[PDB]
Structure 1
Amino acid sequence: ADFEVHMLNKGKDGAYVFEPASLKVAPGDTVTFIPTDKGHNVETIKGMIPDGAEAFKSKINENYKVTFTAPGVYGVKCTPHYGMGMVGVVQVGDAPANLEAVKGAKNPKKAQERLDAALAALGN
């Protein structure tokens, strides 16, 4: 199944957001990160991807489709706006096994606030 996450200057959660900021998908599903506003990218956060995955990094303004295969929780960031909390969480599968590793990953304060909230939104 194919899902879409927008990269926005403004959304329901404030400035510089992925919308939705939390998304649960099945293994083998895809997510397209859409440059609805310009100036953003999407890339893997360090320490917030499960074993079996591959890190990725899109270019600014690239409409970027990722197939998520390895079960677990994934943090993603926009590099331009990481410091502003432009992050998202994709959960692949149920009962993610890498929660404690991803909760311990270090992030800018605004990013950590948003990640903690997305994780809790997901019931983690």
Structure 2
Amino acid sequence: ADFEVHMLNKGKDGAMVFEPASLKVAPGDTVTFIPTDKGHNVETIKGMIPDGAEAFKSKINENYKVTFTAPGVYGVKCTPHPFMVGVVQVGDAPANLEAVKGAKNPKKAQERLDAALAALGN
């Protein structure tokens, strides 16, 4: 299955958001990150992807497709915007939940990550 995540200056969750900010996918599914407004990108957060997964980074304004196979949670961020974060989860019972959940980001970033994890049923 293929999914889309858009990058926005403003959403229900406030300034600088991924929409949706959480997505549960099956191994082999893809997500394309599509900027709706200028000035955004996507990249993995340091230490927040599974064993077996590779880090990634897009250019500002670039449509960027990633295939997710390794099970677990994947924290993503936007380089220029500090609060702009999201989580992609592959499978059930992710093994690296604590890497995201137990992290120490600014309050707004951490609350968005934590809400994403809860939305995903963790």
Bucket of the pairwise TM-score, normalised by the shorter protein: over 0.9
Q: Structure 2: how far apart are the matches of 1:122 and 1:114?
A: 12
Cα gap change, 1:18 to 1:34, in 2 (>3 Å): same
Q: How far is the alpha carbon of 1:120 from its aligned partner?
A: 1.0
Query: Percentage identity across aligned positions?
Result: 99
1:1-57 CA-partner distances (Å, limit 9, x unpaired): 110000000112111000001100001100000011110000000121000000001
Q: Structure 2: how far apart are the matches of 1:106 and 1:69?
A: 27
Q: How far is the alpha carbon of 1:104 from its aligned partner?
A: 2.2
Question: Aligned Cα RMSD in Å?
Answer: 0.9
Q: Structure 1: how far apart are the matches of 2:15 and 2:103?
A: 23
Number of residue pairs aligned between Structure 1 and Structure 2 = 120
> Normalising to structure 1: TM-score of the pair?
0.93
Q: Structure 2: how far apart are the matches of 1:100 and 1:88?
A: 15
Q: Structure 2: how far apart are the matches of 1:102 and 1:111?
A: 11
- Is this contact kept in 2: 1:46–1:105, CA < 8 A? no
Q: How far is the alpha carbon of 1:87 from its aligned partner?
A: 0.4
Structure 1 unmatched ranges of 5 or more:
none
- Is this contact kept in 1: 2:73–2:94, CA < 8 A? yes
Runs of 4+ in 1 over 6 A off after TM superposition: none
User: Hey, what does 1:72 align to over in structure 2?
Assistant: 72
> Normalising to structure 2: TM-score of the pair?
0.94
Q: Secondary structure at the match of 1:95?
A: coil
Structure 2 unmatched ranges of 5 or more:
none
